[PDB]
Design a protein around this ligand. Structure first.
Ligand code: ADP
Ligand code: ADP
Ligand code: K
Ligand code: K
Ligand code: K
Ligand code: MG
Ligand code: MG
Ligand code: MG
Ligand code: MG
Lengths: 377, 377
């Protein structure tokens, strides 16, 4: 049935994502010195200031003010005219530090309750949904041409959104595409939209998908000149959907950034992506969404649910059998299954946690073994 | 097919929700003096402090420090031993104020891009999903018996989670229920769990749903004595799922609290709940989820999608016909359709935005007219 679906993405330097990137940059910094560190680092940004606020239990010593300024500088906010300068903004920390003091470590219970969901679909190369994939790819391309000299009047803040017409389950094409970019006072609006259309949109959206009818809204109100934290406000854990799957699949509440791996909110979600992506790569289903939940102090998950939406190649009884076998979903088990105690997290914080094959949760190593046990074919 | 699903909720006084309630309390206060005010008030709480941070364009004058302290006092954090005192904590504001300066007001375009989803299901009295409904009802009952003298050793912070076994689409019963409550040093753990079980859980969970097998985890690690902001950290827009539908249905990124009605993130989502709830009350479907999206500076929605999951009583072509007719979904139209410019928002910020019939988006006034035009029956 023809039906349209939308997903947005934002760039590095959109204020919410700045806050994510700072949080995960502090996480990485601590993890580099102490991979067993427990962190929950929440960050807030507003026109003058970055507040980095936290509970951290670690041996490590790390410089919050330095880490912050460097993250704001790579994003590019380095002069008042943009909205925000990494070298003169205020950095404020309010992190509580604690230093450290079951027979099988794997049987350690979950710290905090909750629900996590994970998804895969055979509709892109990366086994991710088409909308959120291209949506991210628009903003990423913007950052690229910004940062490579090509289109250097572009400034950091940018939002993208793409709407896709599907008829059933086939992506038929792109109905509308919207893109808004901060830019210097230097460039005119009409020349801006020539360049966005040539350099950003045309190299990313598949041409077969683009029609005579495709409604493109480039800088629709726009003269987007100041942006980033200037006059807006970013907090970690607000681009929760963008981070995930653009609203194709579901979500339990939870944020990833600034949480070390002991946090099921993060690591359970990462593991869920991995179990689903492996299922689809083995051809056990076309589209798979999984809910796993935990209760505080219990180590086995309180629930698993697989929704293969009528797209199975083996009945869900057998499917849920293999899920709960090939994958250790005890909190410390999934930390092991995916080898998470490593500074790999700042890269996660812009452009989507999933869909980028070089992440431990994006590997399809278990594809065949799943294929086998699920009645080989 | 038997399959389990989970949803969590938290109380007023869980730190994220404190921050929500403060944001919406400032919204209400401004709206009482100036209903056309534009606000985006983001709040952060950590052990000593509340940072209320914002952009506000209004004539009104309102006292942030007073509003804050009063909200923290009704929640109950009024002494250091709890974790946090409303009368001695630090309140810090960083709100930018601006005072004010198409032929049809209704045709005014959307301010910001985005996607919103809304849901209804005939599975509860309130046309909301069973899990998130009971989950909320657990925490609400906790707050009630806390606040009515009955169980007065209870302190503010509490989390609940209920997992439901469904066989297909029938809620069969409650597999597990978990509940964790802050409490005074005064009460013992075992007597605590007698009382939680008698007074909170037993009057809320339907007994027919409770089995010999129902795994109840009351205070599982627990001696939860300090809580609220003490040693944790709350930010508005983190209980995004709880707010909604406990992960039964989808979400675009977006937070509600501290956003005045011009924000589609909020009002479009509210309107979507209303269009779906009306569809289901008219018996046009059993379960209905709707995605509506907007692009900045356009007034008609860029997409509408209805997923009636094989539960229609009329084909989705006709359904999407009636949706886009009976409901004005232009930003100013939905503000009108639901009469939103009123201080009604602090009540929204704990216990769920939906499912509570006395909200303008919970009315089923359009039920019959939808029934009619969708081929009367
Ligand atoms: N001292 C600490 N060190 C590291 N992480 C912590 C510490 N205190 C809090 N956290 C954890 O980090 C997580 C981030 O908070 P959050 O997910 O917001 O809780 P909730 O999901 O209930 O809102 C918490 O679940 C909490 O267990
Ligand atoms: N001065 C202002 N007055 C009121 N609301 C504002 C003002 N500045 C920002 N806001 C609005 O409040 C909304 C809340 O921010 P947010 O939803 O986080 O943007 P995004 O969805 O891109 O993250 C913004 O979409 C923005 O349009
Ligand atoms: K969020
Ligand atoms: K965090
Ligand atoms: K807000
Ligand atoms: Mg935001
Ligand atoms: Mg969480
Ligand atoms: Mg939180
Ligand atoms: Mg938004």
């Amino acid at each position: 049935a023809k039906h349209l679906f939308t997903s947005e993405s934002v760039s590095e330097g959109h204020p919410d994502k700045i806050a994510d990137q700072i949080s995960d940059a502090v996480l990485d910094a601590i993890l580099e010195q102490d991979p067993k560190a427990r962190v929950a680092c929440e960050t807030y940004v507003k026109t003058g200031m970055v507040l980095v606020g936290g509970e951290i239990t670690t041996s490590a010593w790390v410089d919050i003010e330095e880490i912050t300024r460097n993250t704001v500088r790579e994003i590019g906010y380095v002069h008042s005219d943009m909205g925000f300068d990494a070298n003169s903004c205020a950095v404020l920390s309010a992190i509580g530090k604690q230093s450290p003091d079951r027979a099988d470590p794997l049987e350690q219970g979950a710290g905090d309750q909750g629900l996590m969901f994970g998804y895969a679909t055979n509709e892109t190369d990366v086994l991710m949904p088409a909308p959120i994939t291209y949506a991210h790819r628009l903003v990423q391309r913007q950052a690229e041409v910004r940062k490579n000299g090509t289109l250097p009047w572009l400034r950091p803040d940018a939002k993208s959104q793409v709407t896709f017409q599907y008829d059933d389950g086939k992506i038929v094409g792109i109905d509308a595409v919207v893109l808004s970019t901060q830019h210097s006072e230097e460039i005119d609006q009409k020349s801006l939209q020539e360049a966005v259309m040539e350099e950003i949109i045309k190299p990313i959206l598949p041409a077969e998908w683009l029609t005579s009818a495709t409604k493109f809204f480039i800088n629709p109100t726009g003269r987007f000149v100041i942006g980033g934290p200037m006059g807006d406000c970013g907090l970690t854990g607000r681009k929760i959907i963008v981070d995930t799957y653009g609203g194709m699949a579901r979500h339990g509440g939870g944020a990833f950034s600034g949480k070390d791996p002991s946090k099921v909110d993060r690591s359970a979600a990462y593991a869920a992506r991995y179990v689903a992506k492996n299922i689809v790569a083995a051809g056990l289903a076309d589209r798979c969404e999984i809910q796993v939940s935990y209760a505080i102090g219990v180590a086995e998950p309180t629930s698993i649910m697989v929704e293969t939406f009528g797209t199975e190649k083996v009945p869900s009884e057998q499917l849920t059998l293999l899920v709960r076998e090939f994958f250790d979903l005890r909190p410390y088990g999934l930390i092991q299954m995916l080898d998470l105690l490593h500074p790999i997290y700042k890269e996660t914080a812009a452009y989507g946690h999933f869909g980028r094959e070089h992440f431990p949760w994006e590997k399809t190593d278990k594809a065949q073994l799943l294929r086998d046990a699920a009645g080989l074919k």
